[PDB]
Amino acid sequence: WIARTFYDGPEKNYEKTMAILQIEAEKAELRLKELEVRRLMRARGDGPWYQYPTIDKALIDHSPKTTPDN
Amino acid sequence: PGIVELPTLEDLKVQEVKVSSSVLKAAAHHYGAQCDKPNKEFMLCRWEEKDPRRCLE
Ligand SMILES: CCCCCCCCCCCCCCCCC[C@@H](O)O[C@H](CO[C@H](O)CCCCCCCCCCCCCCC)COP(=O)(O)OCC[N+](C)(C)C
């Protein structure tokens, strides 16, 4: 009676544990991958991250400058 | 890095215009009217090549 009205079967806890373990393992793998990607992006500068501004080339004036040699 | 190429002193020989600034100013308007074509060719070459050595002729 106690088992029938207060508890469930073993398979429920078993499969809930499986799902929880899958989620946690995926999160750990993602954390490691994110750290490695951050290291590579900061070292190389070839990714979307750690982009530091340079002078906009639209500010340059392309006209004759009263002197032939610029 | 590299060697700067310079024309020989013979390339820089030409019969100089040996009149002073007042004589040039007195005839400046007629000189601009009559000698426009070579002057404009030279100035276009000077502003396009951006190199004195490319505009000697
Ligand atoms: C002959 C009898 C011998 C044995 C006597 C047994 C005595 C039983 C008292 C001990 C109770 C144990 C505590 C249980 C509370 C937690 C369990 C909880 O999960 O059960 C809930 C049920 O809650 C219970 O109703 C709690 C009972 C607590 C009340 C105790 C009774 C006496 C208290 C006195 C109250 C005040 C009296 C008035 C004074 C003026 C439903 O939750 P649920 O997630 O769905 O379960 C899923 C499993 N399913 C599928 C089977 C449903």
Short mmCIF file of N, CA, C and O and ligand atoms in Angstrom, two decimals:
data_model
loop_
_atom_site.label_atom_id
_atom_site.label_comp_id
_atom_site.label_asym_id
_atom_site.label_seq_id
_atom_site.Cartn_x
_atom_site.Cartn_y
_atom_site.Cartn_z
N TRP A 1 0.82 -1.20 0.00
CA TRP A 1 0.00 0.00 0.00
C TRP A 1 0.86 1.26 0.00
O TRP A 1 0.56 2.22 -0.72
N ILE A 2 1.92 1.28 0.81
CA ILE A 2 2.79 2.45 0.87
C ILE A 2 3.45 2.69 -0.49
O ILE A 2 3.47 3.82 -0.99
N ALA A 3 3.97 1.62 -1.10
CA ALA A 3 4.58 1.75 -2.42
C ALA A 3 3.57 2.19 -3.47
O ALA A 3 3.91 2.94 -4.38
N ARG A 4 2.32 1.73 -3.35
CA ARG A 4 1.32 2.04 -4.36
C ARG A 4 0.86 3.49 -4.27
O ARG A 4 0.65 4.14 -5.30
N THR A 5 0.70 4.02 -3.06
CA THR A 5 0.14 5.36 -2.93
C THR A 5 1.17 6.46 -2.68
O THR A 5 0.80 7.64 -2.69
N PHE A 6 2.44 6.12 -2.47
CA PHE A 6 3.43 7.15 -2.18
C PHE A 6 4.62 7.19 -3.13
O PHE A 6 5.31 8.20 -3.16
N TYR A 7 4.87 6.13 -3.90
CA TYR A 7 6.09 6.05 -4.69
C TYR A 7 5.79 5.53 -6.09
O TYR A 7 4.69 5.06 -6.39
N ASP A 8 6.80 5.64 -6.95
CA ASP A 8 6.76 5.13 -8.32
C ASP A 8 7.71 3.94 -8.44
O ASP A 8 8.29 3.47 -7.45
N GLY A 9 7.87 3.44 -9.66
CA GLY A 9 8.76 2.33 -9.93
C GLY A 9 10.20 2.76 -10.12
O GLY A 9 10.52 3.94 -10.22
N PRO A 10 11.11 1.78 -10.15
CA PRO A 10 12.53 2.10 -10.34
C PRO A 10 12.85 2.73 -11.68
O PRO A 10 13.79 3.54 -11.77
N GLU A 11 12.11 2.38 -12.73
CA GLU A 11 12.45 2.84 -14.08
C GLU A 11 12.32 4.35 -14.22
O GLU A 11 13.08 4.96 -14.97
N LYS A 12 11.39 4.96 -13.49
CA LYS A 12 11.23 6.40 -13.54
C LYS A 12 12.49 7.12 -13.08
O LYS A 12 13.03 7.97 -13.80
N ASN A 13 12.99 6.76 -11.90
CA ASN A 13 14.22 7.35 -11.39
C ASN A 13 15.41 7.00 -12.27
O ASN A 13 16.28 7.84 -12.51
N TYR A 14 15.46 5.76 -12.76
CA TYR A 14 16.54 5.32 -13.64
C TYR A 14 16.65 6.21 -14.88
O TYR A 14 17.72 6.74 -15.20
N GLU A 15 15.53 6.41 -15.57
CA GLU A 15 15.56 7.16 -16.82
C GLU A 15 15.68 8.66 -16.59
O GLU A 15 16.29 9.37 -17.40
N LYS A 16 15.12 9.17 -15.48
CA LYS A 16 15.37 10.56 -15.12
C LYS A 16 16.85 10.80 -14.86
O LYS A 16 17.40 11.84 -15.26
N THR A 17 17.51 9.86 -14.18
CA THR A 17 18.95 9.97 -13.96
C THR A 17 19.70 9.95 -15.28
O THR A 17 20.67 10.70 -15.46
N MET A 18 19.29 9.09 -16.21
CA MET A 18 19.93 9.07 -17.52
C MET A 18 19.82 10.42 -18.21
O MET A 18 20.81 10.94 -18.75
N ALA A 19 18.63 11.02 -18.20
CA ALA A 19 18.44 12.32 -18.85
C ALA A 19 19.28 13.40 -18.18
O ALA A 19 19.92 14.22 -18.85
N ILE A 20 19.31 13.41 -16.84
CA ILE A 20 20.09 14.39 -16.10
C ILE A 20 21.57 14.26 -16.43
O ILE A 20 22.27 15.26 -16.66
N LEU A 21 22.07 13.02 -16.45
CA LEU A 21 23.48 12.78 -16.76
C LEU A 21 23.82 13.24 -18.16
O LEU A 21 24.89 13.83 -18.39
N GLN A 22 22.94 12.98 -19.13
CA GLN A 22 23.18 13.44 -20.49
C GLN A 22 23.28 14.96 -20.54
O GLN A 22 24.20 15.51 -21.17
N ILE A 23 22.36 15.65 -19.87
CA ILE A 23 22.38 17.12 -19.88
C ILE A 23 23.68 17.64 -19.28
O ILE A 23 24.33 18.54 -19.83
N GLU A 24 24.08 17.08 -18.14
CA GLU A 24 25.27 17.58 -17.46
C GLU A 24 26.54 17.30 -18.26
O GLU A 24 27.45 18.14 -18.32
N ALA A 25 26.63 16.12 -18.89
CA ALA A 25 27.80 15.82 -19.70
C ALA A 25 27.89 16.74 -20.91
O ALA A 25 28.98 17.22 -21.26
N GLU A 26 26.75 17.02 -21.55
CA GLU A 26 26.76 17.96 -22.66
C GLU A 26 27.21 19.34 -22.21
O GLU A 26 27.99 20.00 -22.91
N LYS A 27 26.73 19.79 -21.05
CA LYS A 27 27.14 21.10 -20.55
C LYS A 27 28.64 21.16 -20.27
O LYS A 27 29.29 22.16 -20.58
N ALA A 28 29.20 20.10 -19.68
CA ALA A 28 30.63 20.09 -19.41
C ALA A 28 31.45 20.15 -20.69
O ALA A 28 32.44 20.90 -20.79
N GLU A 29 31.05 19.36 -21.70
CA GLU A 29 31.74 19.39 -22.98
C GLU A 29 31.67 20.78 -23.61
O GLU A 29 32.66 21.28 -24.15
N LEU A 30 30.50 21.42 -23.53
CA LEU A 30 30.34 22.75 -24.09
C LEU A 30 31.22 23.76 -23.37
O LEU A 30 31.79 24.66 -24.01
N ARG A 31 31.35 23.65 -22.05
CA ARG A 31 32.20 24.57 -21.31
C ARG A 31 33.66 24.44 -21.74
O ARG A 31 34.35 25.45 -21.95
N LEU A 32 34.14 23.21 -21.88
CA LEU A 32 35.52 23.02 -22.32
C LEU A 32 35.73 23.58 -23.72
O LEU A 32 36.73 24.27 -23.99
N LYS A 33 34.79 23.31 -24.63
CA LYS A 33 34.91 23.82 -25.99
C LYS A 33 34.91 25.34 -26.02
O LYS A 33 35.66 25.95 -26.79
N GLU A 34 34.07 25.96 -25.19
CA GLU A 34 34.01 27.42 -25.15
C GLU A 34 35.32 28.01 -24.65
O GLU A 34 35.79 29.03 -25.19
N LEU A 35 35.93 27.41 -23.63
CA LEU A 35 37.22 27.90 -23.17
C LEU A 35 38.27 27.81 -24.27
O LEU A 35 39.04 28.76 -24.49
N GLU A 36 38.32 26.68 -24.98
CA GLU A 36 39.31 26.54 -26.05
C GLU A 36 39.07 27.54 -27.18
O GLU A 36 40.03 28.13 -27.71
N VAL A 37 37.81 27.75 -27.55
CA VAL A 37 37.49 28.69 -28.62
C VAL A 37 37.86 30.11 -28.21
O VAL A 37 38.38 30.89 -29.02
N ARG A 38 37.60 30.48 -26.95
CA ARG A 38 37.99 31.80 -26.47
C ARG A 38 39.50 31.99 -26.53
O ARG A 38 39.98 33.05 -26.95
N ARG A 39 40.25 30.96 -26.13
CA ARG A 39 41.71 31.07 -26.19
C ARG A 39 42.18 31.28 -27.63
O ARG A 39 43.02 32.15 -27.89
N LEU A 40 41.64 30.50 -28.57
CA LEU A 40 42.06 30.64 -29.96
C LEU A 40 41.70 32.01 -30.53
O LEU A 40 42.52 32.64 -31.21
N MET A 41 40.48 32.48 -30.26
CA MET A 41 40.05 33.77 -30.79
C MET A 41 40.90 34.91 -30.22
O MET A 41 41.26 35.84 -30.95
N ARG A 42 41.21 34.86 -28.93
CA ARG A 42 42.02 35.93 -28.35
C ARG A 42 43.45 35.88 -28.85
O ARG A 42 44.09 36.93 -29.00
N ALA A 43 43.99 34.68 -29.12
CA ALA A 43 45.36 34.60 -29.60
C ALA A 43 45.49 35.03 -31.06
O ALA A 43 46.46 35.70 -31.42
N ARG A 44 44.53 34.68 -31.91
CA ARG A 44 44.67 34.90 -33.34
C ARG A 44 43.99 36.17 -33.83
O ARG A 44 44.53 36.86 -34.71
N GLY A 45 42.81 36.50 -33.31
CA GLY A 45 42.08 37.66 -33.80
C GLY A 45 41.32 37.45 -35.09
O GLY A 45 40.91 38.43 -35.71
N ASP A 46 41.13 36.20 -35.52
CA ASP A 46 40.47 35.90 -36.78
C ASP A 46 39.00 35.53 -36.62
O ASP A 46 38.37 35.11 -37.59
N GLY A 47 38.44 35.67 -35.42
CA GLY A 47 37.06 35.33 -35.19
C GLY A 47 36.20 36.54 -34.92
O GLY A 47 36.66 37.68 -34.94
N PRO A 48 34.90 36.31 -34.69
CA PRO A 48 34.01 37.43 -34.34
C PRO A 48 34.33 38.08 -33.01
O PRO A 48 33.89 39.21 -32.77
N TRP A 49 35.07 37.41 -32.13
CA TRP A 49 35.34 37.93 -30.80
C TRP A 49 36.68 38.64 -30.76
O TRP A 49 37.57 38.41 -31.58
N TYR A 50 36.82 39.52 -29.76
CA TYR A 50 38.05 40.27 -29.52
C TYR A 50 38.46 41.09 -30.74
O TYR A 50 39.62 41.12 -31.14
N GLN A 51 37.49 41.76 -31.35
CA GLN A 51 37.73 42.62 -32.50
C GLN A 51 37.96 44.04 -32.01
O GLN A 51 37.03 44.68 -31.49
N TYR A 52 39.17 44.54 -32.16
CA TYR A 52 39.47 45.87 -31.66
C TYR A 52 39.51 46.87 -32.80
O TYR A 52 40.06 46.58 -33.87
N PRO A 53 38.92 48.05 -32.60
CA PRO A 53 38.69 48.96 -33.72
C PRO A 53 39.97 49.47 -34.36
O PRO A 53 40.99 49.70 -33.69
N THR A 54 39.91 49.64 -35.67
CA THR A 54 40.93 50.33 -36.45
C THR A 54 40.29 51.54 -37.12
O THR A 54 39.07 51.72 -37.09
N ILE A 55 41.12 52.38 -37.72
CA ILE A 55 40.62 53.61 -38.34
C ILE A 55 39.75 53.26 -39.53
O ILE A 55 40.12 52.45 -40.39
N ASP A 56 38.57 53.88 -39.59
CA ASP A 56 37.68 53.70 -40.73
C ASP A 56 38.29 54.33 -41.97
O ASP A 56 38.72 55.49 -41.95
N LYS A 57 38.34 53.57 -43.06
CA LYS A 57 38.94 54.06 -44.29
C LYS A 57 38.02 54.98 -45.08
O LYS A 57 38.46 55.57 -46.07
N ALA A 58 36.76 55.12 -44.66
CA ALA A 58 35.87 56.09 -45.28
C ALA A 58 36.21 57.53 -44.90
O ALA A 58 35.67 58.45 -45.51
N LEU A 59 37.09 57.73 -43.92
CA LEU A 59 37.50 59.06 -43.51
C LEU A 59 38.59 59.65 -44.38
O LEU A 59 38.87 60.85 -44.27
N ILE A 60 39.21 58.86 -45.25
CA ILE A 60 40.31 59.34 -46.08
C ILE A 60 39.75 60.17 -47.22
O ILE A 60 38.74 59.82 -47.84
N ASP A 61 40.41 61.29 -47.51
CA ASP A 61 40.02 62.20 -48.58
C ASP A 61 40.84 61.89 -49.82
O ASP A 61 42.07 61.98 -49.80
N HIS A 62 40.16 61.54 -50.91
CA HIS A 62 40.81 61.18 -52.18
C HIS A 62 40.55 62.31 -53.16
O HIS A 62 39.60 62.27 -53.95
N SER A 63 41.40 63.32 -53.13
CA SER A 63 41.28 64.49 -53.99
C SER A 63 42.67 65.01 -54.29
O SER A 63 43.62 64.70 -53.57
N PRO A 64 42.83 65.78 -55.37
CA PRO A 64 44.09 66.51 -55.55
C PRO A 64 44.35 67.44 -54.38
O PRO A 64 43.43 68.09 -53.87
N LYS A 65 45.60 67.51 -53.96
CA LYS A 65 45.97 68.14 -52.69
C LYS A 65 46.95 69.29 -52.87
O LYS A 65 47.90 69.44 -52.10
N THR A 66 46.75 70.11 -53.90
CA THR A 66 47.56 71.31 -54.15
C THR A 66 49.03 70.97 -54.35
O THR A 66 49.86 71.87 -54.53
N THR A 67 49.37 69.69 -54.33
CA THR A 67 50.73 69.21 -54.46
C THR A 67 50.63 67.86 -55.14
O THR A 67 49.83 67.01 -54.70
N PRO A 68 51.38 67.63 -56.22
CA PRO A 68 51.22 66.38 -56.98
C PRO A 68 51.52 65.12 -56.19
O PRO A 68 50.91 64.08 -56.46
N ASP A 69 52.43 65.18 -55.22
CA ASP A 69 52.87 64.00 -54.48
C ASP A 69 52.13 63.82 -53.17
O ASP A 69 52.73 63.42 -52.17
N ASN A 70 50.84 64.16 -53.15
CA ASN A 70 49.97 64.00 -51.98
C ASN A 70 50.42 64.92 -50.85
O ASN A 70 51.26 65.79 -51.05
N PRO B 1 66.05 49.17 -47.45
CA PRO B 1 65.67 48.13 -48.41
C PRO B 1 65.42 48.71 -49.80
O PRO B 1 64.53 49.54 -49.97
N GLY B 2 66.20 48.26 -50.78
CA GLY B 2 66.10 48.77 -52.13
C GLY B 2 67.01 49.96 -52.36
O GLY B 2 67.56 50.57 -51.43
N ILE B 3 67.17 50.30 -53.63
CA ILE B 3 68.03 51.40 -54.06
C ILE B 3 67.16 52.45 -54.74
O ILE B 3 66.34 52.11 -55.61
N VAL B 4 67.33 53.70 -54.35
CA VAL B 4 66.56 54.80 -54.93
C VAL B 4 67.14 55.15 -56.29
O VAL B 4 68.31 55.53 -56.40
N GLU B 5 66.33 55.01 -57.33
CA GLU B 5 66.77 55.30 -58.69
C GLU B 5 66.65 56.79 -58.96
O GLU B 5 65.59 57.39 -58.73
N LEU B 6 67.74 57.40 -59.42
CA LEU B 6 67.75 58.80 -59.77
C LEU B 6 68.26 58.98 -61.19
O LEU B 6 69.21 58.31 -61.59
N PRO B 7 67.65 59.88 -61.96
CA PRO B 7 68.15 60.13 -63.32
C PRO B 7 69.50 60.82 -63.29
O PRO B 7 69.85 61.53 -62.34
N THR B 8 70.28 60.60 -64.35
CA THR B 8 71.59 61.21 -64.44
C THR B 8 71.47 62.72 -64.62
O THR B 8 70.43 63.25 -65.01
N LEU B 9 72.57 63.42 -64.32
CA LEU B 9 72.59 64.87 -64.47
C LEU B 9 72.36 65.30 -65.91
O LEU B 9 71.94 66.44 -66.14
N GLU B 10 72.63 64.42 -66.88
CA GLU B 10 72.36 64.76 -68.27
C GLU B 10 70.86 64.80 -68.55
O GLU B 10 70.40 65.58 -69.39
N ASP B 11 70.09 63.95 -67.87
CA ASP B 11 68.64 63.97 -68.03
C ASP B 11 68.01 65.26 -67.51
O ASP B 11 66.89 65.58 -67.91
N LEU B 12 68.71 65.99 -66.65
CA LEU B 12 68.20 67.23 -66.08
C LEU B 12 68.80 68.47 -66.73
O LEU B 12 68.88 69.52 -66.09
N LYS B 13 69.23 68.38 -67.99
CA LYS B 13 69.73 69.53 -68.72
C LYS B 13 68.67 70.01 -69.70
O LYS B 13 68.16 69.23 -70.51
N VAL B 14 68.33 71.29 -69.62
CA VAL B 14 67.37 71.91 -70.53
C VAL B 14 67.65 73.40 -70.55
O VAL B 14 68.15 73.96 -69.57
N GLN B 15 67.34 74.04 -71.67
CA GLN B 15 67.54 75.48 -71.81
C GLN B 15 66.58 76.20 -70.87
O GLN B 15 65.37 76.25 -71.11
N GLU B 16 67.12 76.77 -69.79
CA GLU B 16 66.31 77.38 -68.76
C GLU B 16 65.74 78.72 -69.23
O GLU B 16 66.35 79.44 -70.02
N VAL B 17 64.55 79.03 -68.74
CA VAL B 17 63.94 80.34 -68.94
C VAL B 17 64.56 81.29 -67.92
O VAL B 17 64.34 81.16 -66.72
N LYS B 18 65.35 82.25 -68.41
CA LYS B 18 66.22 83.06 -67.57
C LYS B 18 65.68 84.47 -67.36
O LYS B 18 66.46 85.43 -67.34
N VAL B 19 64.37 84.62 -67.20
CA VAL B 19 63.76 85.92 -66.94
C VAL B 19 63.25 85.93 -65.50
O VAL B 19 62.93 84.88 -64.92
N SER B 20 63.17 87.13 -64.93
CA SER B 20 62.83 87.27 -63.52
C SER B 20 61.32 87.22 -63.32
O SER B 20 60.54 87.03 -64.26
N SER B 21 60.89 87.41 -62.07
CA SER B 21 59.49 87.22 -61.72
C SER B 21 58.60 88.33 -62.28
O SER B 21 57.43 88.07 -62.59
N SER B 22 59.12 89.55 -62.40
CA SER B 22 58.31 90.64 -62.93
C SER B 22 58.00 90.43 -64.41
O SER B 22 56.88 90.70 -64.86
N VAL B 23 58.99 89.96 -65.18
CA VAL B 23 58.77 89.68 -66.59
C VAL B 23 57.75 88.57 -66.77
O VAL B 23 56.87 88.63 -67.63
N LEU B 24 57.86 87.52 -65.95
CA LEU B 24 56.89 86.43 -66.00
C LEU B 24 55.49 86.91 -65.63
O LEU B 24 54.51 86.51 -66.26
N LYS B 25 55.39 87.76 -64.61
CA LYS B 25 54.08 88.24 -64.19
C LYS B 25 53.45 89.15 -65.24
O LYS B 25 52.23 89.12 -65.44
N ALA B 26 54.27 89.95 -65.93
CA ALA B 26 53.73 90.84 -66.95
C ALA B 26 53.09 90.07 -68.10
O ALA B 26 52.06 90.48 -68.63
N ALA B 27 53.69 88.94 -68.48
CA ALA B 27 53.20 88.13 -69.58
C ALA B 27 52.46 86.88 -69.13
O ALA B 27 52.26 85.97 -69.94
N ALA B 28 52.04 86.81 -67.87
CA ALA B 28 51.47 85.57 -67.34
C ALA B 28 50.17 85.21 -68.03
O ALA B 28 49.91 84.03 -68.30
N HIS B 29 49.32 86.19 -68.32
CA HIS B 29 48.00 85.89 -68.89
C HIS B 29 48.12 85.37 -70.31
O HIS B 29 47.51 84.34 -70.66
N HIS B 30 48.89 86.05 -71.16
CA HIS B 30 49.10 85.55 -72.52
C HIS B 30 49.85 84.23 -72.52
O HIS B 30 49.58 83.37 -73.36
N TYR B 31 50.80 84.06 -71.60
CA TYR B 31 51.53 82.80 -71.51
C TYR B 31 50.60 81.65 -71.14
O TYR B 31 50.73 80.54 -71.68
N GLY B 32 49.67 81.89 -70.23
CA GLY B 32 48.69 80.86 -69.90
C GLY B 32 47.73 80.59 -71.04
O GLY B 32 47.30 79.45 -71.24
N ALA B 33 47.38 81.62 -71.80
CA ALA B 33 46.46 81.43 -72.92
C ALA B 33 47.11 80.64 -74.05
O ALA B 33 46.48 79.75 -74.64
N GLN B 34 48.37 80.93 -74.36
CA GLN B 34 49.03 80.35 -75.53
C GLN B 34 49.68 79.00 -75.24
O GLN B 34 49.65 78.11 -76.09
N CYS B 35 50.28 78.83 -74.06
CA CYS B 35 51.03 77.63 -73.73
C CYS B 35 50.22 76.66 -72.86
O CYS B 35 50.80 75.94 -72.04
N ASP B 36 48.90 76.64 -73.04
CA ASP B 36 48.06 75.85 -72.15
C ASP B 36 48.27 74.35 -72.34
O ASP B 36 48.30 73.60 -71.36
N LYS B 37 48.38 73.89 -73.58
CA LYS B 37 48.38 72.45 -73.83
C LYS B 37 49.56 71.72 -73.21
O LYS B 37 49.33 70.74 -72.46
N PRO B 38 50.82 72.10 -73.45
CA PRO B 38 51.92 71.38 -72.79
C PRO B 38 51.87 71.50 -71.27
O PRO B 38 52.19 70.53 -70.57
N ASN B 39 51.47 72.66 -70.76
CA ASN B 39 51.39 72.84 -69.31
C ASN B 39 50.36 71.91 -68.70
O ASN B 39 50.60 71.31 -67.64
N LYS B 40 49.21 71.75 -69.35
CA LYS B 40 48.17 70.89 -68.80
C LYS B 40 48.54 69.42 -68.93
O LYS B 40 48.25 68.62 -68.04
N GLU B 41 49.21 69.04 -70.03
CA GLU B 41 49.74 67.68 -70.12
C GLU B 41 50.71 67.41 -68.98
O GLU B 41 50.63 66.37 -68.31
N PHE B 42 51.64 68.34 -68.74
CA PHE B 42 52.63 68.15 -67.68
C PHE B 42 51.97 68.06 -66.31
O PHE B 42 52.35 67.22 -65.49
N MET B 43 50.99 68.92 -66.04
CA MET B 43 50.36 68.91 -64.73
C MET B 43 49.51 67.66 -64.52
O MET B 43 49.48 67.11 -63.41
N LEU B 44 48.82 67.20 -65.56
CA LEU B 44 48.07 65.95 -65.45
C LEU B 44 49.02 64.78 -65.18
O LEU B 44 48.75 63.94 -64.31
N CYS B 45 50.14 64.73 -65.90
CA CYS B 45 51.13 63.69 -65.65
C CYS B 45 51.68 63.78 -64.24
O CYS B 45 51.87 62.75 -63.58
N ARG B 46 51.94 64.99 -63.76
CA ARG B 46 52.51 65.19 -62.43
C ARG B 46 51.55 64.73 -61.34
O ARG B 46 51.96 64.07 -60.38
N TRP B 47 50.27 65.06 -61.48
CA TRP B 47 49.29 64.65 -60.49
C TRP B 47 48.88 63.19 -60.61
O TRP B 47 48.34 62.64 -59.65
N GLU B 48 49.10 62.56 -61.76
CA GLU B 48 48.74 61.15 -61.90
C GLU B 48 49.87 60.21 -61.52
O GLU B 48 49.64 59.22 -60.82
N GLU B 49 51.10 60.49 -61.96
CA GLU B 49 52.22 59.61 -61.66
C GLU B 49 52.72 59.77 -60.23
O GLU B 49 53.22 58.81 -59.64
N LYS B 50 52.60 60.98 -59.66
CA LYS B 50 53.07 61.28 -58.31
C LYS B 50 54.57 61.05 -58.16
O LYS B 50 55.07 60.79 -57.07
N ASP B 51 55.30 61.15 -59.27
CA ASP B 51 56.74 60.93 -59.27
C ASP B 51 57.42 61.97 -60.16
O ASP B 51 57.09 62.09 -61.34
N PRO B 52 58.36 62.75 -59.62
CA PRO B 52 59.08 63.72 -60.46
C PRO B 52 59.85 63.07 -61.59
O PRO B 52 59.98 63.66 -62.67
N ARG B 53 60.37 61.86 -61.37
CA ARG B 53 61.19 61.18 -62.37
C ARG B 53 60.39 60.68 -63.56
O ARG B 53 60.99 60.35 -64.59
N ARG B 54 59.06 60.62 -63.46
CA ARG B 54 58.22 60.14 -64.55
C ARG B 54 57.68 61.27 -65.42
O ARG B 54 56.89 61.00 -66.33
N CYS B 55 58.09 62.52 -65.17
CA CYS B 55 57.48 63.67 -65.82
C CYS B 55 58.52 64.59 -66.45
O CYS B 55 58.25 65.76 -66.70
N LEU B 56 59.73 64.08 -66.70
CA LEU B 56 60.81 64.94 -67.16
C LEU B 56 60.59 65.43 -68.59
O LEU B 56 60.86 66.60 -68.90
N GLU B 57 60.11 64.55 -69.48
CA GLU B 57 59.92 64.93 -70.87
C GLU B 57 58.90 66.06 -71.01
O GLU B 57 59.11 67.01 -71.77
C1 LIG C 1 -2.40 0.07 9.34
C2 LIG C 1 -1.54 1.31 8.95
C3 LIG C 1 -0.03 1.11 9.32
C4 LIG C 1 0.90 2.15 8.60
C5 LIG C 1 0.57 3.63 8.98
C6 LIG C 1 1.20 4.64 7.95
C7 LIG C 1 1.15 6.13 8.46
C8 LIG C 1 1.32 7.15 7.29
C9 LIG C 1 1.76 8.57 7.80
C10 LIG C 1 3.19 8.97 7.31
C11 LIG C 1 3.15 9.83 6.00
C12 LIG C 1 4.53 9.82 5.26
C13 LIG C 1 4.86 11.21 4.61
C14 LIG C 1 4.48 11.23 3.10
C15 LIG C 1 4.57 12.68 2.51
C16 LIG C 1 5.39 12.71 1.17
C17 LIG C 1 4.85 11.68 0.12
C18 LIG C 1 4.12 12.39 -1.04
O1 LIG C 1 4.89 12.33 -2.18
O2 LIG C 1 2.87 11.77 -1.28
C19 LIG C 1 1.87 12.68 -1.66
C20 LIG C 1 0.59 12.39 -0.85
O3 LIG C 1 0.61 13.23 0.30
C21 LIG C 1 0.03 12.66 1.45
O4 LIG C 1 -1.34 12.90 1.44
C22 LIG C 1 0.65 13.32 2.71
C23 LIG C 1 0.02 12.80 4.04
C24 LIG C 1 0.41 13.71 5.25
C25 LIG C 1 -0.72 13.80 6.33
C26 LIG C 1 -0.52 12.79 7.50
C27 LIG C 1 -1.88 12.31 8.14
C28 LIG C 1 -2.03 12.78 9.64
C29 LIG C 1 -1.50 14.25 9.87
C30 LIG C 1 -2.38 15.06 10.91
C31 LIG C 1 -3.06 16.33 10.25
C32 LIG C 1 -3.81 17.23 11.32
C33 LIG C 1 -4.99 16.47 12.02
C34 LIG C 1 -6.12 17.44 12.52
C35 LIG C 1 -5.81 18.06 13.93
C36 LIG C 1 -6.90 19.05 14.39
C37 LIG C 1 1.60 12.55 -3.16
O5 LIG C 1 2.80 12.91 -3.86
P1 LIG C 1 3.00 12.37 -5.43
O6 LIG C 1 4.04 13.21 -6.14
O7 LIG C 1 1.68 12.49 -6.17
O8 LIG C 1 3.47 10.77 -5.42
C38 LIG C 1 3.71 10.13 -6.68
C39 LIG C 1 3.38 8.61 -6.53
N1 LIG C 1 1.96 8.32 -6.89
C40 LIG C 1 1.91 8.15 -8.35
C41 LIG C 1 1.60 7.05 -6.19
C42 LIG C 1 0.89 9.30 -6.55
#
